[PDB]
Design a protein around this ligand. Structure first.
Ligand code: NAG
Ligand code: NAG
Ligand code: NAG
Ligand code: NAG
Ligand code: NAG
Ligand code: NAG
Ligand code: NAG
Ligand code: NAG
Ligand code: NAG
Ligand code: NAG
Ligand code: NAG
Ligand code: NAG
Ligand code: NAG
Ligand code: NAG
Lengths: 673, 203, 673, 203
């Protein structure tokens, strides 16, 4: 009763039908869309490089203080006055990073995907698109990753690339200072979702390196009818964002003639036989099961967190304690390591030596001091015999529970990279065991199994099949490996769906969003589409009076947003909705003049009727759409549901045999099943 | 009765090839001679220059007829091989290196000066003879930072690090175990207080 | 009046609604579709390797006879008795390859794409899916490529992979010997197009190496509403076909642990700056212009060929003369070459020496004796200074006109590879000229320009934007090069659309197929959808008689396939179509019993009413669909067109205000604009 | 007063390293000596075996302390380099090769036996001395087909092919130009008859 829907249909009036005749009389309305879809990718690539340049310099400031601190509190007295320093340095950043979220607005909490695949679906979640949400999210993921927590940074690139999509498309900046008289004709919906679709497919490419995966993502959620031109602009807006991220970072590092580092995460360059095709299936089942342990007990945690810690004073303290425990467990676990190795190459960014021979370096200080992306790349590409298999066990068994207990906090970060790292960890740990029981001549290289454990763990945690196979095929730069990965993610969904739901679906169902999804249940195939409606209809005839429509709008007991018009007993001659109706009452159009643009004024927000103080009659023709998408009764629900979803509809209307309105099907009726 | 250049070369270029031969055989001989102790960088520095000089002289006719005569250009391959071995060793040498060598010679004499099992001997005396050496080594990596720096220095420090640890048990005692247990078990005790105290504040 | 449409809507009856209740009572109807989509890819990979194994052995038999013939007619008398031998060897194969097409059926002529992107569209072209068409096409492309003509082999893989899609989906083999009682419930349309879409996206991947390009191809033509499950089976059927082509050819060549050669054409492995981004745009305009010369004069040829050579006796002779001239021009052009080079590596498959010094070999005999794919790969990857720029000029200026004069013949081969070869030829010839006027330090490597001329020439000849950018990105195995290629193909369409239409569109318009395409013209935006209909409607009331429906079916002056039912003046209570109606008249269902399966019998072909010899009345309830997709009048055409296309509709019905049928919109009405 | 193995090696292994040194310097010297005429394959075949034998002997302790002592394992690099040069030259040798060499020696003596501008001399006599040589060469490629076959044979045939063409103008006359114009202009004449005759059959 709080989340009102999104109108994707253009309610053509006589005013729209006259204004589109006016603008058509040198066809300069579509060439103005390519400019927005061009500079909607440049502005996303620059945000994606502004995060990456800042966070590595702040991490380089933060970790060298610590490794210079425990090079002098060795050889002498205690180390505890450095453990306290690393605990308070991991607490001081996340204190600010949790205060600026838990008090100003809670919408920026978590990742950005479940609040953006519901808007894409048609549900306007409160706030979300406001600039303040962008400023607090892009300054909350910098301050939390360097804060020291087990959270990825490639999560919040989708939401941050979607907010700037629906902010420059309007040309308004509704805070203050209207900043343009340009970019009218776009101040409506049916453009809002068409540019949020081009924004969210410019954050998936700019964070993973896959442009052709981003369009499949934005299509997968955006289940509209297929039009080539719109996809041919989403592809053009996606291809820019992985070019204005190479061209800035390559200016930053060195020479401009080296166009590597295609995104924020970079898998390397990258041979198998048929005889191990069952073995990969035997990984995917494991990828379901541990996934359904990660995705279940978090649920038993999250309702606890929603039951007792539902106030801003406590969750800040709880985030600080999560950061301090994340420091102390890592320091205990590197204090007691016995496995030390000689350094080589750039496999250790900050080499740490304590309680080890001279020249050699501790190997447990790897995968805590360096970034998660560098550790995941090192797990894909290291030559065999490089990891002690007791190190990976105590690392995975700690990092799994830390990444489970950290997600759902009131800070702003994602959950992609703390799934790939767990998956590659136990994938390489499983790949070693196929070498200590055979000779391991050629076909037991752990670089394959470290890949196909990381592909399994994502499908186990985040059920996502078509748009994830492609972005695992494009970032690996190899099309021969496309066939086992598809065979893994197909398994890890249909094993994991037996136990528990998705991770992105619990955080939608636990907020009571309607969220109708593609297709309909086959068990409910014969509902015959007369049971699924609201039986009385508070419709309004055309041109009665004014007091009728005032008393049908101003009513506390019911909130209805769409009203069909009738004639003579009824005819269903089109429908009028609240926005247009209170626009007509804000002016005086009583029959006792204006163009299309007047309706657009104050478009984002419409004043409530209690501020519209103060009979005659008004003629509702030339303000309504003369042809709603109607369906009869007697029709199957699968057909009714497909029609409703496949187009973008807020108000389906059912009729009688003699064309009389007998019910109205809205979104919340179809969502309940 | 004389084909010009194709079966045989003139006797004005063959002595140049014999001179390059005499250079390259002796360079390989001296380069090969260094064993486990690596003194190649500090012993084959003079005769490495001459081979390069000879190559330049041959390069400076009698350059098309002598290294573009066939596939398997063997003069270019030998020269290229020498160049590759030289660059990866990365000598770049000499006063600092000489000082380091002197220190190594001195540091190593104190071991057998104090030698004689029972490696718990008067080697505390070599402690201040040892550590500053390693300190100088770290300082030398700060000098050639703006990768391995040499091969004479690396092997000389390698031998001392092999002697200092795994044949003379020269470990350092540890003093701190109870504070890094107390602080850790105190910090891992606050969440089980926090959640249980927030649960019991429901009245 | 010959090409009747395809029904994609399931006309739910009471019999369908009872039978789907019967089959649902362990959900074994969808798990039977994954088996067909699995073994629809294996059977396409085996055809794609059966072509490739046979054609290289026959080419190896044919060319070594010739190069052994002109090694003995050198050093002695004339060479003309070998020119006659190479002319008659290029004539003898194409004689049989043109006789078996020009006499049995003309549908296998040309490529396979314009007869399969019209079926995909909904037009049942005559024949096409019959086994005989498959047998003559897959044995007509072998016999023509080795015959010696400038035609590609990766063209006819789409049609040959689409015929076996709609032949094993039925389980009938309607020739004789029904061969199964399995695979009922699929003997209808709405499965026919769903498996032709999975077949045609298994020929694009099996011929180029791009699985994710094939699904975008089949979607681009298949403009239906988006459902995730169907795309998630088309992707699964596409990924198989590039794995059962590696695994067979790698058994054939050598060891099975080398999974290269991903398809029939294999680009290699594969750096640019911003400062040459305009230069690539300056290629694409050229790629339009020469494209619009290739795509225009062929038109002036093809109507000539349709005006005077429209009989099977002459076009066989004309194909033989094209083959003989293709021999003789190549022999004259290699007889007079002066440029000879020493051999190295495997750059020449069959080395030819005539009138050259010992050890060296003629370089003009390259790119005539070897395959086009090997020459295109050699033009992408050769080091600079390897081609004499007089050789490429006389090669391109001959091969352009030969590939223009050969296309449109009555043989069965494609036009992809004779576009990539021309594009790479003048691309490398343009890339040399940027080296003979600068120093050409790093950024003037001809390997880039030989790529981006070949990408330009396809967009110039075959206007195809979204499904071609992806298959040029996947076969090059580099995602950095995705941005200039998109910037080239975008130019070469909007320069070439000024002059002349597509190449695949002229061969649709010159056969008068309706072929409505996605979207509607913006100049005709206000037609108001009452002008675009047939005004009288020969509808039929329910339960009149028998003589009424017999006299409304049996009528020479008009052919109508769908009839709406009325009641009382009219009500539009659903519609009945001819197939069901003559099924009911083939039995005796007059009101004076059967399941759903009876309608399916003789599904492919329905007997005409003149064989249904010989009142009472029949009740048309429980045989009609009770809810057609209706629209009112007063509605804009863009809305009407989108609804018609986006779903699959054969009979849209317009109504009145009081729900009275006043017109019927069919496909040929919308197609004429 | 004796560190075991780290600063110095025993005097039981150093003579082995000196023996490998004496082998490798002389192998490089003989290998380097072959000039434009390549006789390396046929002159450095005996002393190539000994280096390999010495390497095997060293490989067969005194193998961990002598080639796993450091980075830049210089003994393994020299040996590896020799192995690489040997394989790409691809000698595989010897009777057939000897016969070819004899033929080359004979074929080449007939040039200066008949030498003396005016290269239109009695060299028709060497025609049957030339061609069969090349014929044998092609037959030899049929013998080692189931890539370059050697380096002595390749260079020996290369010299003859360089002498036969670009310093002795020994071209072959051509007899056929008018038939390969007549047949070509006859075959390129049938389409302009065919289309024009099918156009005029409209009555
Ligand atoms: C090599 O050089 C040495 C020292 O100059 C000289 O004594 C010797 O004769 C030379 N030998 C040859 C083969 O040139
Ligand atoms: C180069 O060779 C010449 C002739 O043998 C000799 O006179 C001269 O000293 C050489 N110069 C160098 C730089 O080796
Ligand atoms: C033959 O000699 C020429 C002359 O330079 C050389 O370019 C070529 O590599 C030689 N070929 C062989 C097979 O040795
Ligand atoms: C090695 O080759 C490089 C690059 O050509 C050159 O700059 C350098 O002088 C060479 N060094 C030696 C020792 O030959
Ligand atoms: C070596 O010489 C350099 C340059 O003159 C000087 O800066 C440095 O102090 C010297 N070092 C030693 C060890 O003498
Ligand atoms: C080491 O010092 C000794 C004694 O002064 C001297 O004899 C010897 O040459 C020195 N060796 C080195 C390598 O400096
Ligand atoms: C070790 O040497 C010390 C000092 O000479 C001597 O006091 C001690 O008894 C020795 N211990 C052993 C175990 O030989
Ligand atoms: C090298 O071997 C030769 C021949 O056996 C011998 O005369 C000479 O003394 C040896 N030289 C060395 C340094 O071993
Ligand atoms: C190996 O070395 C030993 C000791 O020098 C020597 O006796 C023996 O002949 C050598 N054998 C071979 C095969 O070189
Ligand atoms: C140090 O010596 C060890 C002993 O084998 C060797 O493995 C290592 O490569 C050496 N390191 C350096 C830097 O030379
Ligand atoms: C070269 O190395 C290969 C592979 O290890 C080995 O089989 C062969 O015997 C070696 N040959 C020589 C000449 O050392
Ligand atoms: C070389 O020996 C082989 C094997 O005995 C024989 O087959 C061949 O005829 C011989 N060739 C010559 C040239 O003697
Ligand atoms: C060539 O033949 C001559 C004369 O018989 C002989 O002296 C010489 O050794 C031969 N050379 C070769 C390379 O066989
Ligand atoms: C070339 O030599 C031949 C044979 O000795 C002689 O007849 C002729 O006059 C000579 N021609 C020239 C141009 O010297």
């Amino acid at each position: 009763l709080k989340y009102e829907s999104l109108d994707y249909d253009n309610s053509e009036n006589q005013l729209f039908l006259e204004e589109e005749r006016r603008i058509n009389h040198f066809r300069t309305v579509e060439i103005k869309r390519w400019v927005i879809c061009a500079l909607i990718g440049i502005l996303t690539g620059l945000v994606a490089c502004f995060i990456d340049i800042v966070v590595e310099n702040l991490a380089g400031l933060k970790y060298r203080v610590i490794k210079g601190n425990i090079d002098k509190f060795t050889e002498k007295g205690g180390l505890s006055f450095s453990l306290l320093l690393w605990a308070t340095l991991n607490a001081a950043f996340v204190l600010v990073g949790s205060v600026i979220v838990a008090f100003i607005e809670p919408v920026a909490a978590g990742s950005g995907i479940p609040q953006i695949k519901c808007f894409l679906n048609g549900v306007k979640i409160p706030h979300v698109v406001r600039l303040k949400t962008l400023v607090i999210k892009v300054s909350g993921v910098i301050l939390s990753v360097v804060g020291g927590l087990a959270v990825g940074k490639e999560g919040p690139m989708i939401h941050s690339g979607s907010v700037i999509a629906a902010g420059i498309s309007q040309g308004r900046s509704t805070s203050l200072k209207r900043d343009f008289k340009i970019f009218e004709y776009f101040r409506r919906d049916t453009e809002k979702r068409d540019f949020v679709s081009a924004g969210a497919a410019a954050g998936v490419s700019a964070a993973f390196g896959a442009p052709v995966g981003g369009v499949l993502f934005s299509l997968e959620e955006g289940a509209s009818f297929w039009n080539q031109f719109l996809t041919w602009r989403i592809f053009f807006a996606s291809m820019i964002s992985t070019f204005t991220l190479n061209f800035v970072l390559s200016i930053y590092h060195g020479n401009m003639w080296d166009l590597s580092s295609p995104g924020l995460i970079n898998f390397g360059r990258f041979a198998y036989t048929i005889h191990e095709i069952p073995v990969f299936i035997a990984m995917g089942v494991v990828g379901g099961v541990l996934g359904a342990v990660f995705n279940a007990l978090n649920y038993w945690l999250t309702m606890f967190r929603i039951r007792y810690i539902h106030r801003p004073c406590l969750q800040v303290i709880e985030a600080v304690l999560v950061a301090a425990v994340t420091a102390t467990v890592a320091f205990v676990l590197i204090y007691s390591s016995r496995d030390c190795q000689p350094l080589q190459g750039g496999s250790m960014s900050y080499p740490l030596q304590l309680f080890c021979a001279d020249g050699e370096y501790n190997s447990m200080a790897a995968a805590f001091f360096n970034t998660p992306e560098k550790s995941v790349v090192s797990l894909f590409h290291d030559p065999p015999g490089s990891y002690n298999p007791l190190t990976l066990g105590l690392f995975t068994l700690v990092y799994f529970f830390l990444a489970c207990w950290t997600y759902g906090l009131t800070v702003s970060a994602g959950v992609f990279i703390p799934s790939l790292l767990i998956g590659a960890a136990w994938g390489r740990l499983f790949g070693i065991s196929l070498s200590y029981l055979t000779g391991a001549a050629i076909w037991a290289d752990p670089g394959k199994y470290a890949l196909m454990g990381a592909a399994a763990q994502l499908g186990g945690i985040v059920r996502m099949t078509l748009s994830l196979t492609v972005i695992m095929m494009e970032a690996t730069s190899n099309v021969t490996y496309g066939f086992p990965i598809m065979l893994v993610l197909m398994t890890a969904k249909i094993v994991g769906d037996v136990f528990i739901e998705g991770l992105y679906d619990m955080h939608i169902q636990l907020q009571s969003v309607p969220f109708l999804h593609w297709e309909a249940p086959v068990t409910s195939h014969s509902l015959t589409a007369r049971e699924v409606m609201s039986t009385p209809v508070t419709c309004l005839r055309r041109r009665e009076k004014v007091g009728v429509i005032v008393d049908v709008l101003s009513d506390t007991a019911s909130n209805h947003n769409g009203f069909p018009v009738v004639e003579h007993p009824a005819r269903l001659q089109g429908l009028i909705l609240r926005s247009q109706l209170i626009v007509l009452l804000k002016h005086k159009v009583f029959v006792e003049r204006l163009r299309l643009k007047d309706f657009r004024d104050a478009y984002p927000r419409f004043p409530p009727i209690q501020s519209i103080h103060v009979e005659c009659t008004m003629d509702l023709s030339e303000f309504m759409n003369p042809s709603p998408y109607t369906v009869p009764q007697e029709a199957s629900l699968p057909r009714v549901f497909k029609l409703f979803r496949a187009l973008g509809l807020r108000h389906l209307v059912v009729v009688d045999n003699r064309n009389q309105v007998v019910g109205l099907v809205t979104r919340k009726d179809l969502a309940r099943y | 009765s004389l084909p010009p250049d194709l079966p045989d070369l003139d006797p004005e270029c063959r002595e140049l090839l014999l001179d390059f031969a005499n250079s390259s055989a002796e360079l390989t001989g001296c380069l090969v001679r260094s064993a486990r102790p690596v003194r190649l960088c500090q012993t084959c520095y003079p005769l490495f220059q001459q081979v390069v000089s000879k190559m330049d002289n041959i390069s400076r006719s009698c350059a098309r007829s002598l290294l573009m005569a066939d596939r398997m250009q063997i003069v270019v391959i030998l020269s290229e091989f020498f160049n590759t071995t030289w660059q990866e060793a990365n000598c770049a040498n000499s006063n600092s290196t000489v000082y380091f060598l002197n220190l190594f010679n001195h540091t190593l004499t104190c071991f057998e000066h104090n030698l004689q099992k029972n490696y718990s001997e008067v080697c505390k005396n070599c402690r201040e003879a040892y550590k500053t050496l390693s300190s100088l080594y770290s300082e030398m990596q700060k000098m050639n930072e703006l990768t391995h720096l040499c091969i004479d220095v690396e092997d000389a420090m390698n031998i001392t690090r092999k002697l200092w640890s795994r044949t003379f048990n020269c470990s350092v005692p540890c003093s701190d175990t109870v504070p890094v247990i107390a602080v850790s078990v105190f910090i891992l005790f606050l969440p089980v207080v926090f959640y249980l105290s927030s649960f019991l504040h429901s009245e």
